[PDB]
Amino acid sequence: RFLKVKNWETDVVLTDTLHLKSTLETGCTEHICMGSIMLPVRTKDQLFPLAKEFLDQYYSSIKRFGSKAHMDRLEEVNKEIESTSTYQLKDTELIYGAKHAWRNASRCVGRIQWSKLQVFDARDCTTAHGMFNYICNHVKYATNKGNLRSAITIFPQRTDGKHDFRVWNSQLIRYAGYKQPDGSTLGDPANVQFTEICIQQGWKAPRGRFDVLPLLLQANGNDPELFQIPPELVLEVPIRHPKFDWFKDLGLKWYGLPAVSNMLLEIGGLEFSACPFSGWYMGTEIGVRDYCDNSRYNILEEVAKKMDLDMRKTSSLWKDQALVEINIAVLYSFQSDKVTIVDHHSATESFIKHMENEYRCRGGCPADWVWIVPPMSGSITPVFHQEMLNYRLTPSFEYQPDPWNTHVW
């Protein structure tokens, strides 16, 4: 029942008890581990125990468990669900919930920051036009001219499931991708399907390498509508290298604001299907994944060629050499433009300190090792050597089906 986790570099052994508060399932069984798999309406009956569990955790957190106010709130919510089949969170409960969904995010290395989240309550939003305004304001607040600030914007909860709010985009800011007659892909290959949806919905595409996608916003279950983020709100960084003069000539850039927009926020049984949230980048996200994945911008070959590396043999490690240089350029370019970015050494060092705090104060920290370890230089970061237990606590950020697969027009 009490579980131990060991760090193999330091020999420090921590004891996890928080996993006993675990609600959702992992995908693993006693017979099979599914730890490397990417992707492994609530009735009145279903909803009250979920509200109770959340309210109990909330009242505990402000040291008023079992109090008059605790018991009166539980009764109020019970009455509301029995009468209306749902209930509404107090602003304090929504802020607590969003912060804890971040705290519980087992795949996120940046959780040391969890209590410093700005929460924008957009539950009064009714139209897609309202959504666009709120999102532009999120974008401007979070960007803060390069001094990035963590934020979430929360739109109205699911009701009967026919009036969902949804941002159809996977992040607020992403680049278009276009299948060419050539057979190659122009832009970001990850976004080819979504760009096709936008064009079919009437977006006039510039058909370039780094075209910022419009937002496709769905309010109150209505058909989604198109909006362009004001260009002057989208901060972008040209990529250059501190030593290699030729790097700038590759014509690379990236955006400053990573803002995930397709996840679902579950708080006390309630489901917030449009809840875009943002922090700041870890450099390997752009330099390793977005630039060097074979199915992404796939620039390893081009950079290796400019460096004049021996590309005849895998064992010269030309791919590894070019990888480090691309990642040096990403960090240098963001730092020179004074746009917040974290390197993987500093980010993982932080997460370790966070994990230690969480073990001492909360009895544990759910963590998905497969996601926490950076996609380059894994064992030279401290998280590689750290045993982690993965489990699902609520409030939570959850994946949900892409809306074009689900939406009836």
Ligand X SMILES: CCSCCC(=N)NCCC[C@H](N)C(=O)O
Question: Is 125 in the active site?
Answer: no
In 3D, which of 336, 292, 352 has the Cα closest to residue 318?
292
Tokens representing 266? 């579950």
334 contributes a contact to ligand X by CB under 6 A: no
328 contributes a contact to a copy of itself by CB under 8 A: yes
285 contributes a contact to ligand HEM by CB under 6 A: yes
Q: Is 369 annotated as a binding residue?
A: no
Q: Is 171 annotated as a binding residue?
A: yes
404 contributes a contact to ligand H4B by CB under 6 A: no
234 contributes a contact to ligand X by CB under 6 A: no
Catalytic residue among 42, 73, 111, 240: 111
243 contributes a contact to a copy of itself by CB under 8 A: no
Nearest distance from C-beta of residue 391 to ligand X, angstroms: 20
Residue 315 interacts with which of a copy of itself, ligand H4B, Zn ion, none, CB < 5 to 8 Å by class: a copy of itself
User: Position of tokens 């928080």?
Assistant: 18
Nearer to a copy of itself, 20 or 69 (CB): 20
Question: Is 285 in the active site?
Answer: yes
User: Position of tokens 């089906």?
Assistant: 401
Question: Is 108 in the active site?
Answer: yes
By CB atoms closer than 10 A (0-12, 13-18, 19+), residue 182 is exposed
33 contributes a contact to ligand H4B by CB under 6 A: no
Q: Are 58 and 96 in contact (CB under 8 A)?
A: yes
Which positions from 57 through 116 interact with ligand X, judged by CB under 6 A?
Answer: 108, 110
Buried b (16+ CB within 10 A) or exposed e, 125-154: beebebbbebbbebbbebbeebebebbbbb
36 contributes a contact to ligand H4B by CB under 6 A: yes
Q: Which of 277, 332, 334, 391 is in the footprint of ligand HEM by CB under 6 A?
A: 277
Contact code string over 361-390 relative to ligand H4B, x by CB under 6 A: ---------xx------------xxxx---
Q: Is 384 annotated as a binding residue?
A: yes
Helices (H), 62-144: 68-84, 91-103, 128-143
293 contributes a contact to ligand H4B by CB under 6 A: no
Q: Is 281 annotated as a binding residue?
A: yes
Question: Is 280 in the active site?
Answer: yes
* SS3 assignment for 37-76: CCCCCCCHHHHHHHHHHHHHHHHHHCCCCCCHHHHHHHHH
By CB atoms closer than 10 A (0-12, 13-18, 19+), residue 312 is exposed
Which positions from 87 through 106 interact with ligand HEM, judged by CB under 6 A?
Answer: 102, 105
Nearer to ligand HEM, 77 or 257 (CB): 257
Helix pair angle (68-84, 44-61), 10° resolution: 160
Residue 327 interacts with which of ligand H4B, Zn ion, a copy of itself, none, CB < 5 to 8 Å by class: a copy of itself
Gap between the Cα atoms of 153 and 118, Å rounded: 9
Q: Are 136 and 265 in contact (CB under 8 A)?
A: no
Q: Is 371 annotated as a binding residue?
A: yes
374 contributes a contact to ligand X by CB under 6 A: no
Q: Is 361 annotated as a binding residue?
A: no
Gap between the Cα atoms of 32 and 387, Å rounded: 19
Q: Which residues are annotated as a binding site for heme b?
A: 108, 399
Q: Which residues are annotated as a binding site?
A: 36, 108, 171, 280-281, 285, 370-371, 384, 399
For the annotated catalytic residues, the residue numbers are: 108, 111, 280, 285
Binding site for ligand X (CB under 6 A): 108, 110, 258-260, 277-279, 281-282, 285-286, 289-290
Q: Which residues are annotated as a binding site for L-arginine?
A: 171, 280-281, 285
